[PDB]
RNA sequence: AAAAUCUA
RNA sequence: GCGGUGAAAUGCGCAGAUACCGGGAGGAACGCCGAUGGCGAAGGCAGCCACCUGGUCCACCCGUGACGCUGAGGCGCGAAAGCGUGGGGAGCAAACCGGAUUAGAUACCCGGGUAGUCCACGCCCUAAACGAUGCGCGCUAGGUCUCUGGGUCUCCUGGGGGCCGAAGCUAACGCGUUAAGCGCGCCGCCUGGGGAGUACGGCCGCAAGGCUGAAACUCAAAGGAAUUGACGGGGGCCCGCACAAGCGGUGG
């Protein structure tokens, strides 16, 4: 799977302060990594579909998080979407 | 082929007929028998009494080659499964040992209509 | 008659080469003996059998041996 | 797979053509000692010996190394994958580090810039080539020889392949593209893998002219002719066969083994 | 990097020279695909249950290496290439579970 | 292996 | 002689079959573990190995701070059978041929046997797609069996799988902390039987055919559970010159 070190390299970057292991953007990026890796996984395992369901659910979850973030404050959203490169 | 004291005896015991055969210790048969060699025809070939007569005839043929001892091996669950053994008891041949070796699949070949 | 577990003390059930331990589980037929006769737990019985199959592949354990006199 | 065409014209709604993706970019063939002139529509006496050949389109014959063993141990770089108007298969320009460039029939799944070699020492792996008695039994193979030191002649067409079933003395057993089983000498060289352009078969010529481009002339039915010119030449109102269907020269077409019986090579075949 | 136990059975009827000969090839493949060896053990000749390659006996090896998770497939394939090599079985190592505590 | 049917 | 069946025949076998041994080819499927068992949203999923990957649960009491639920259309999955292109083909087996049974037998039984069953990619998208029970949360007795996780463990505490059953509900049957109980939120859907999932329109599909979906008309019923009885080539116990064993009769 993904490496713990690789996880920390993300958590440290997206945290608003050290120890923020659960923030909105934190979870969004955290999920986005798995969305990307899983997406690439499907790019060679077209037959697999349950994993693909998991992908759909992950994308959905991320989109809900983006819902709350965009609704609360559009500026932090403005930064996060730009740093994760989504919506297009 | 030739004449030997020790040997083996196979029992092919199906439902519609039970047949048997004697063989050298290696695997190559000496002589054989069935319900048909007793003249019986049809379900009469699967009859346990017919298996008795078949085993007795097979033993009678084996004794001509000088056979005395034989390791026995059985297959199938026909209505004459045990009678082969029973006839081979007082056949005049040394029973020596009895072994089951019914071929059975680990689920692979799809069965017939039944 | 006899429960299989009581025969031996503590041992590795994941180990797939201790043939002297694993052999006492297949009877005079090679049949993977039922849990009600070996007297094991589910978690134990499962990985036991799973390592058993492994041991079968290596040529260590027999797949099916011919039954004796009957 | 194959490229297709929108029906902006009839006889084109079906016409398909292979995607030349595997070709590395090269219109110019290796203009070194590889191209060569080519011709012929009928035998040396001006008579025809094969019906319906002609027209066609000009072709430079690509000289191929079918006898790849004269450079034992010498490796080479898969320089290119080229087209060849003389065979179903694609070809491959390899640069031997010796300096000599040559051609080889392009095997399936052959990356450009691959390591490739020819010798009994060779790693059993796609592209390489070696004596049959060295290839592990049960392996794909193509461009196999026949008699040792006489060049490859078995399985040279697109998608073609043969499998090794077992060894026996100084001979080995092959399952040919015709499904035929056969003994072939152990010393015969052969290249490991399967021939590329597997998607060849799926092409549709689409229209008439496409045949002509390949040189294939129009083929007239025997039953369309006259009794002089052909057996079936009854012709009288789309008449049925005059019994039984047979060639313009006499021999019956459907079911008639033409292989000579007491051929010595018969002692090496099976089915 | 993952802990792996590797079991390899080989031809029971051949000289010691061919034995070490093939062992060498195993070592080669191992180092070639990044298999850093550890507690290796040579179980030696043993009597098999069913006849493998029409032979009731079989020689045994038992490596225990660590390597990147991927090529551990391909490595096995390399071991398959040699004809004299009979059985091959790589197993992902696990904690020795306890029975009859 | 055999027992097909029974006007309103 | 085999094979086969209720008994047989067709079939195969002195051109040497069946049964037995050794050598080899190829395909499909996973015995024992194995279970009232486990997983998944459904369809479904079983030899073992490795890689890749989803969902799920326990502990710590760490982080975010109502970010939740449902969800028309849209989008993806979707057994078997069937369709396309190219493979594969042992076993099984529609269709078809033969044998028997029969008044007939285009069947049940038997001997042969092709698509198909298998892999690659693509289409079809229905089902007794069944718990015939939409989803989410909460409150409402206990007993027992089992899968799994934690904790010093004949006990305590989470998460699934079955039976009996408090209250209560139900037309009865039966459900009942895995509600059909008491409540809320939201989607889907029903309005007598036949006509009919038919017709026309529209959309989809290579075709087969699928999604929406009527009316004229006709009937005075259709239907649900339960009671009673008769009835069964249903079961269990049991009886009578009913059979059997036996003596003489008519039918001539
Ligand atoms: Mg939302
Ligand atoms: Mg755009
Ligand atoms: Mg019979
Ligand atoms: Mg019978
Ligand atoms: Mg009988
Ligand atoms: Mg047999
Ligand atoms: Mg058989
Ligand atoms: Mg059959
Ligand atoms: Mg020149
Ligand atoms: Mg020139
Ligand atoms: Mg001339
Ligand atoms: Mg000339
Ligand atoms: Mg001239
Ligand atoms: Mg010209
Ligand atoms: Mg270059
Ligand atoms: Mg192979
Ligand atoms: Mg031509
Ligand atoms: Mg032509
Ligand atoms: Mg002429
Ligand atoms: Mg003329
Ligand atoms: Mg004519
Ligand atoms: Mg004419
Ligand atoms: Mg004639
Ligand atoms: Mg022929
Ligand atoms: Mg001729
Ligand atoms: Mg000739
Ligand atoms: Mg651990
Ligand atoms: Mg009638
Ligand atoms: Mg009637
Ligand atoms: Mg009536
Ligand atoms: Mg009437
Ligand atoms: Mg006939
Ligand atoms: Mg024979
Ligand atoms: Mg054999
Ligand atoms: Mg033997
Ligand atoms: Mg295979
Ligand atoms: Mg569900
Ligand atoms: Mg749910
Ligand atoms: Mg997981
Ligand atoms: Mg939802
Ligand atoms: Mg189907
Ligand atoms: Mg059709
Ligand atoms: Mg018939
Ligand atoms: Mg009748
Ligand atoms: Mg008839
Ligand atoms: Mg009549
Ligand atoms: Mg008739
Ligand atoms: Mg017909
Ligand atoms: Mg649907
Ligand atoms: Mg329904
Ligand atoms: Mg209904
Ligand atoms: Mg309880
Ligand atoms: Mg515990
Ligand atoms: Mg605790
Ligand atoms: Mg409790
Ligand atoms: Mg608690
Ligand atoms: Mg706790
Ligand atoms: Mg518990
Ligand atoms: Mg219940
Ligand atoms: Mg119930
Ligand atoms: Mg109940
Ligand atoms: Mg009460
Ligand atoms: Mg009340
Ligand atoms: Mg309860
Ligand atoms: Mg109505
Ligand atoms: Mg009606
Ligand atoms: Mg209606
Ligand atoms: Mg319809
Ligand atoms: Mg219509
Ligand atoms: Mg209209
Ligand atoms: Mg319209
Ligand atoms: Mg139809
Ligand atoms: Mg229909
Ligand atoms: Mg209406
Ligand atoms: Mg209307
Ligand atoms: Mg009723
Ligand atoms: Mg009487
Ligand atoms: Mg009397
Ligand atoms: Mg009288
Ligand atoms: Mg009288
Ligand atoms: Mg009278
Ligand atoms: Mg009278």
Swiss-Prot record, chain B:
Pfam families named in the record: Ribosomal_S11
Keyword RNA-binding included in the entry's annotation: yes
PROSITE patterns: RIBOSOMAL_S11
Signal peptide: none
HAMAP family: Ribosomal_uS11
NCBIfam families: PRK05309.1, uS11_bact
Protein name (record): Small ribosomal subunit protein uS11
Encoding gene (name): rpsK
UniProtKB/Swiss-Prot annotation, chain C:
Keyword terms, alphabetized: Ribonucleoprotein, Ribosomal protein, RNA-binding, rRNA-binding
Domain of life: Bacteria
Keyword rRNA processing included in the entry's annotation: no
Molecular function (Gene Ontology), one example: small ribosomal subunit rRNA binding
One GO biological process term: translation
A GO cellular component entry from the record: ribonucleoprotein complex
Subunit structure: Part of the 30S ribosomal subunit. Forms a tight heterodimer with protein bS6.
Family membership noted in the UniProt record: Belongs to the bacterial ribosomal protein bS18 family.
Primary role: Binds as a heterodimer with protein bS6 to the central domain of the 16S rRNA, where it helps stabilize the platform of the 30S subunit.
Name under which the protein is recorded: Small ribosomal subunit protein bS18
Originating gene: rpsR
Curated annotation (Swiss-Prot), chain D:
Signal sequence bounds: none
GO molecular function: rRNA binding; structural constituent of ribosome; transferase activity
Spans annotated as Disordered: 222-271
Gene3D superfamilies named among the record's database cross-references: 2.30.30.30, Nucleic acid-binding proteins, Ribosomal protein L2, domain 3
Domain of life of the organism encoding this protein: Bacteria
Keyword Ribosomal protein in annotation: yes
SUPFAM superfamilies: Nucleic acid-binding proteins (SSF50249), Translation proteins SH3-like domain (SSF50104)
Keyword Ribosomal protein: yes
GO biological process: cytoplasmic translation
Subunit-structure text: Part of the 50S ribosomal subunit. Forms a bridge to the 30S subunit in the 70S ribosome.
Homology family: Belongs to the universal ribosomal protein uL2 family.
Role noted for this protein: One of the primary rRNA binding proteins. Required for association of the 30S and 50S subunits to form the 70S ribosome, for tRNA binding and peptide bond formation. It has been suggested to have peptidyltransferase activity; this is somewhat controversial. Makes several contacts with the 16S rRNA in the 70S ribosome.
Protein name: Large ribosomal subunit protein uL2
Organism of derivation: Thermus thermophilus (strain ATCC BAA-163 / DSM 7039 / HB27)
Swiss-Prot record, chain E:
Biological processes per GO annotation: translation
Top-level division of the source organism's lineage: Bacteria
Transmembrane residue ranges: none
A GO MF label: structural constituent of ribosome
GO terms for cellular component: cytoplasm; ribonucleoprotein complex; ribosome
PROSITE patterns given in the database record: RIBOSOMAL_S6
InterPro entries the record matches: Ribosomal_bS6, Ribosomal_bS6_CS, Ribosomal_bS6_sf, Ribosomal_S6_plastid/chlpt, Transl_elong_EF1B/ribsomal_bS6
Keywords assigned by UniProt, alphabetized: Ribonucleoprotein, Ribosomal protein, RNA-binding, rRNA-binding
Oligomeric form and interacting partners: Part of the 30S ribosomal subunit. Forms a tight heterodimer with protein bS18.
Family: Belongs to the bacterial ribosomal protein bS6 family.
Function: Located on the outer edge of the platform on the body of the 30S subunit.
Protein name: Small ribosomal subunit protein bS6
Higher taxonomy: Bacteria, Thermotogati, Deinococcota, Deinococci, Thermales
């Amino acid at each position: 799977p993904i490496t713990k070190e690789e996880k920390q390299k993300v958590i440290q970057e997206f945290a608003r302060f050290p120890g923020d292991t659960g923030s909105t953007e934190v979870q969004v990026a955290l999920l986005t990594l798995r969305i990307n890796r899983l997406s690439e996984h499907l790019k060679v395992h077209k037959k697999d579909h349950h994993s693909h369901r998991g992908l759909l659910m992950m994308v959905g979850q991320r989109r809900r998080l983006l819902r709350y973030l965009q609704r609360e404050d559009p500026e932090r959203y403005r930064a996060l979407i730009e740093k994760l490169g989504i919506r297009g | 082929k030739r004449q030997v004291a020790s040997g083996r005896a196979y029992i092919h015991a199906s439902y519609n007929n039970t047949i048997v055969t004697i063989t050298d210790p290696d695997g190559n048969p000496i002589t054989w028998s069935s319900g048909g060699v007793i003249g019986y025809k049809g379900s009469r070939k699967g009859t346990p009494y017919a298996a008795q007569l078949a085993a007795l005839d097979a033993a009678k043929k084996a004794m001509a080659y000088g056979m005395q001892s034989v390791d026995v091996i059985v297959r199938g669950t026909g209505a004459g499964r045990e009678q082969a053994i029973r006839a081979l008891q007082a056949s005049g041949l040394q029973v020596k040992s009895i072994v089951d070796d019914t071929p059975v699949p680990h689920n692979g070949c799809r069965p017939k209509k039944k | 008659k006899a429960k299989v577990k009581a025969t031996l003390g503590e041992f590795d059930l994941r180990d797939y080469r201790n043939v002297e331990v694993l052999k006492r589980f297949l009877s005079e037929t090679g049949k993977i003996l039922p849990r009600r006769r070996t007297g094991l737990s589910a978690k134990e019985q499962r990985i036991l059998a799973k390592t058993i199959k492994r041991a079968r592949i290596l040529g260590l354990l027999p797949f099916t041996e011919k039954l004796v006199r009957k | 797979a194959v490229k297709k065409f929108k029906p902006y014209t009839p006889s084109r709604r079906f016409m398909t053509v292979a995607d030349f993706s595997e070709i590395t970019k090269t219109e110019p063939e290796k203009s070194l000692v590889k191209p060569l002139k080519k011709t012929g529509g009928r035998n040396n006496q001006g008579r025809i010996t094969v019906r319906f050949r002609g027209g066609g389109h000009k072709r430079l014959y690509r000289i191929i190394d079918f006898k790849r063993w004269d450079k034992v141990g010498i490796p080479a770089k898969v320089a290119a994958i080229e087209y060849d108007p003389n065979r179903s298969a694609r070809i491959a320009l390899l640069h031997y580090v010796d300096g000599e460039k040559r051609y080889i029939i392009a095997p399936d799944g052959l990356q450009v810039g691959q390591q490739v070699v020819a010798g009994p020492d060779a790693p059993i792996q796609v592209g390489n080539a070696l004596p049959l008695r060295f290839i592990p039994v049960g392996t794909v193979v193509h461009a196999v020889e026949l008699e040792p030191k006489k060049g490859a002649k078995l399985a040279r067409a697109a998608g073609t392949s043969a499998q090794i079933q077992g060894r026996e003395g100084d001979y080995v057993i092959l399952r040919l593209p015709s499904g035929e089983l056969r003994k072939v000498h152990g010393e015969c060289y052969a290249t490991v893998g399967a021939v590329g352009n597997a998607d060849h078969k799926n092409i549709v010529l689409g229209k008439a002219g496409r045949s002509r481009w390949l040189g294939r002339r129009p083929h007239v039915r025997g039953a369309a002719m006259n009794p002089v010119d052909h057996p079936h030449g009854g012709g009288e109102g789309r008449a049925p066969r005059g019994r039984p269907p047979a060639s313009p020269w006499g021999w019956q077409t459907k079911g008639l083994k033409t292989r000579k019986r007491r051929k010595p090579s018969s002692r090496f075949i099976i089915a | 990097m993952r802990r792996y136990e590797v079991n390899i059975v080989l031809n029971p009827n051949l000289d010691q020279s061919q034995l070490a000969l093939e062992k060498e090839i195993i070592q080669r493949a191992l180092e070639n695909y990044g298999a850093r060896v550890e507690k290796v053990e040579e179980l030696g000749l043993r009597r098999l249950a069913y006849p493998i390659a029409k032979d009731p006996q079989g020689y045994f090896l038992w490596y225990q290496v660590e390597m990147p998770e991927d090529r551990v497939n391909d490595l096995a394939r390399e071991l398959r290439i040699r004809d004299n090599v009979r059985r091959v079985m790589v197993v992902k190592s696990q904690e020795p579970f306890l029975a009859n505590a």
